Amino acid sequence: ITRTITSANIDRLRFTFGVQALVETTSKGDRNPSEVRLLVQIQRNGGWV
Amino acid sequence: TVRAVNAWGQQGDPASVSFRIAAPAAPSRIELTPGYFQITATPHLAVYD
Amino acid sequence: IRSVNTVGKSAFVEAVGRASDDAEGYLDFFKGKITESHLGKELLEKVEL
Amino acid sequence: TVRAVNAWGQQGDPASVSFRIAAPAAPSRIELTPGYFQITATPHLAVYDPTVQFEFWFSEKQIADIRQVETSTRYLGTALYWIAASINIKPGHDYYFYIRSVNTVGKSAFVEAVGRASDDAEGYLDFFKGKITESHLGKELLEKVEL
């Protein structure tokens, strides 16, 4: 996505992420978890740390 | 509708959500296995309930 | 047939079914096993002659 | 863990207990009553569990592995018994029921039961005593018995 906050008087940054739905449907029923992974990265000059 | 209140009893701005409880859907298909003077019918829905 | 639960009832769905087509399979294992007493009396008196 | 507190909010020493919620056990035995082109299978557990049912799976040929049951066989249903009746089901050929215990917590490992249909003998033919008289016989049989 990237947003380029470029603010002036910021002190700390809070990210509000989430998952729309995590079900994993199978035959009939008995849904299971999905175990997603996400990554939050800073600009840090050029290296996306 | 959910409203937040503080320790002084003052309510807050309301936040609303809407959902629905509906009758079960009609069966999608019916498997009809013939037998000796008998018929075995097994229904199947689009989604398992 | 229709879906039923504690909330409500759904509209019926029609399934047209037939019994067995009277195959020889239901006779295939009567192979050599109707001999002496399962036949009608007129048939007995016509086969004894 | 349970801790006691007084009216001043001070918690006490903790007291611990440990329990376990486990998947239902596999059925101990399977009673396979043959029928007319049908088999009635009733499972029985070592201990009765009012909160359990049984999933049945059908195989016309045996599979040594018990892991591909969900892939190599057909799903039959969940109940306390199963009356498998079909035209394609015929006596004299063995059939295999892979059954397991099912509930809201989990599923148990499958258990195999090899069953046969009825022997198809005079028990199903004494019903016919003195009743194939004039019209049930094939046309060649008619023209051979009229002569």
UniProtKB/Swiss-Prot annotation, chain A:
Disulfide bonds: none annotated. It is found in: Virion; Host cytoplasm. It comes from the Viruses. Belongs to the Caudoviricetes tip attachment protein J family. Interacts with host LamB. Attaches the virion to the host receptor LamB, inducing viral DNA ejection. During tail assembly, initiates distal tail tip assembly by interacting with gpI, gpL and gpK. During virus entry to host cell, binds strongly to host LamB in an irreversible attachment. The binding induces structural changes in the tail leading to viral DNA injection through LamB trimeric pore. This is Tip attachment protein J. It comes from Escherichia phage lambda (Bacteriophage lambda). The chain holds residues 100 to 148 of 1132 of the full protein.
